[PDB]
Design a protein around this ligand. Structure first.
Ligand SMILES: O=C(O)CCC(=O)C(=O)O
Ligand code: NI
Length: 276
């Protein structure tokens, strides 16, 4: 069992950091290319993560009383969008300068955030199948990344409370017939890969940001704690990948639209209802 994020996957920052120096950026990109997952510690202030955590835990009962509770593959892995109220939309979360420095370098200047969602891992949750969140664009072809998932733990993630299992280096694998229509990896392909490069699982302190290739094999695992484990999820895509826009209140248009940190957004005159 690991006690901390492995050194080879990790870059240590403070929330004051606005940009990586050239050497740090080179290393961030080398890690994303080789391993397909990068852990940035010390990115977000406690004041932001506290507010987002409280809001998602406060919203969980409304999510659980819906007619169809939207669940990811297996019981206890709940899809939950964080609020898009103006008071809970933070530039350092939506438009993080370090995150976009990395995504611009990997995916290009016109890369755009097209997801503002989240994952509530409930006490007694089941084991998700190993999957990729975004597919390879053609079967049996090696191609560069077109998307980067940006994961924001809203509490300390532990081995106990369902820190995500990640398969380092799996993002470049695209063998024939190995992914089903749900993006699940065939068990035979998992066992082949496990012999060459086994999965890792590690604690991630709140205030960290995980950047990973959208094609990285991973799985939610059981939350064996007494408390729901909230994750806030964003995904940066090349400009040419079709995605529906994020609905945002036109009250944040002033700072979201016209940034060189692009968001695929539709600005709405009223309130936006994130749960329905
Ligand atoms: O919340 C997690 O740790 C994993 C969830 C997941 O990977 C998914 O639902 O696609
Ligand atoms: Ni997933």
């Amino acid at each position: 069992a690991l006690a901390a994020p492995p050194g080879e996957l990790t870059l240590a920052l403070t929330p004051d950091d606005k940009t990586l120096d050239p050497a740090s950026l080179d290393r961030a990109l080398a890690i994303l290319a080789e391993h397909g997952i990068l852990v940035l510690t010390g990115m977000l202030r406690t004041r932001l993560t506290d507010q987002l955590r409280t809001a998602m835990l406060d919203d969980l009962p409304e999510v659980l009383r819906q007619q169809d509770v939207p669940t990811n593959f297996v019981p206890g892995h709940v899809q939950q969008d964080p609020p898009v109220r103006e008071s809970l939309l933070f530039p350092d979360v939506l438009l993080n300068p370090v995150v976009y420095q990395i995504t611009h370098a990997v995916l290009g200047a016109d890369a755009r955030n097209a997801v503002y969602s989240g994952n509530m891992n409930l006490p007694g949750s089941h084991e998700q199948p190993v999957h990729l969140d975004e597919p390879h664009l053609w079967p049996g072809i090696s191609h560069p990344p077109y998307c980067l998932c940006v994961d924001v733990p809203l509490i300390d993630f532990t081995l106990e409370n369902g820190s995500t299992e990640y398969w380092p280096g799996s993002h470049v694998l695209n063998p024939d017939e190995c992914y089903d229509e749900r993006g699940c990896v065939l068990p035979a392909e998992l066992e082949r890969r496990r012999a060459v490069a086994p999965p890792v699982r590690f604690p991630i302190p709140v205030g960290s940001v995980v950047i990973r290739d959208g094609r990285l094999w991973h799985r939610g695992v059981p939350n064996l704690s007494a408390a729901p484990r909230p994750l806030l999820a964003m995904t940066h895509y090349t400009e040419w990948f079709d995605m529906p826009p994020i609905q945002l209140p036109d009250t944040v248009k002033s700072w979201v639209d016209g940034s060189d940190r692009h968001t695929h957004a539709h600005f709405v005159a009223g309130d936006v209802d994130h749960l329905t």
